Amino acid sequence: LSGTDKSVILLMTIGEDRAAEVFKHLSTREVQALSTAMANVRQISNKQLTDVLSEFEQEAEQFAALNINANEYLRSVLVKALDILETRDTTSGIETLNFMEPQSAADLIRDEHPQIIATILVHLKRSQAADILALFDERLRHDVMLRIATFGGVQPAALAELTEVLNGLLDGQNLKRSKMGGVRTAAEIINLMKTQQEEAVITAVREFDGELAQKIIDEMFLFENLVDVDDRSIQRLLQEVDSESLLIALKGAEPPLREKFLRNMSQRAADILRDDLANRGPVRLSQVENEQKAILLIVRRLAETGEMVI
């Protein structure tokens, strides 16, 4: 069980009033995440209750409770004697503007004023700002660089307003949480089609836009590209591929790819595979395509685990 699940069980088992009181001491993101997780709860078993309660007790003893509300206590002490969460939120927004993809952030801030872009990048990590600037056009990127070189500081109010606007934009994006609609999704769809319709769609997209089809082609693994994969990954792949499946799949493979597979096998196994290829009769194209699809699925599984580099 994740910590979110344990927290959800704890909130469900303490009563509605207590859970509501706890929500008053949690941030908006945490409350939203817990409410979303509480929505999908269908059953809580005996272990999921007892272990969660014991872990909650051990955690309450871990930091020994205490920690009176910092904001109210600090305000009362300052008032009686005589930043804070706003500074923490600005720091979090600085963190939020570094974990995103460089392309997404660049597109988000592409239309902003060059001084605004420079101000944002100053507070960002060096690598993230470097990647974002690499995606801008020459003129805008160099203008932002020059403005950074002469950055004179920003008043806290303007920085806070910019942070609030960026937080609103991020909230809108997260509410959208745009489902993958780029060339990668189409390539995944295209890879699972039959060869006929796959090639027809690729050719038609190239007819409409050669660049778009090439982008989809670059994002798809339609077999016959294992020749460009390193020898170590191919050797790792051969340990998970059945000999008969490899034999059937390599029947329709090009001689370069066939030699690429043979070079990564043991010499005895390579000779056996060559003899089987020379002796086995014609194989229906559908079976070869199915075997190649299975090999591609194995390749994807290995790549997801980090054992294979594509």
Partner: peptide, 27 residues
């Protein structure tokens, strides 16, 4: 369901919030 449920119900809501925050951070 021993007295631990009742004992946990009497804990400060801030303590529960901090435990929840730590659990979510550990994810």
């Amino acid at each position: 369901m021993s007295q631990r449920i009742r004992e946990m119900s009497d804990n400060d809501p801030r303590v529960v919030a901090l435990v929840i925050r730590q659990w979510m951070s550990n994810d």
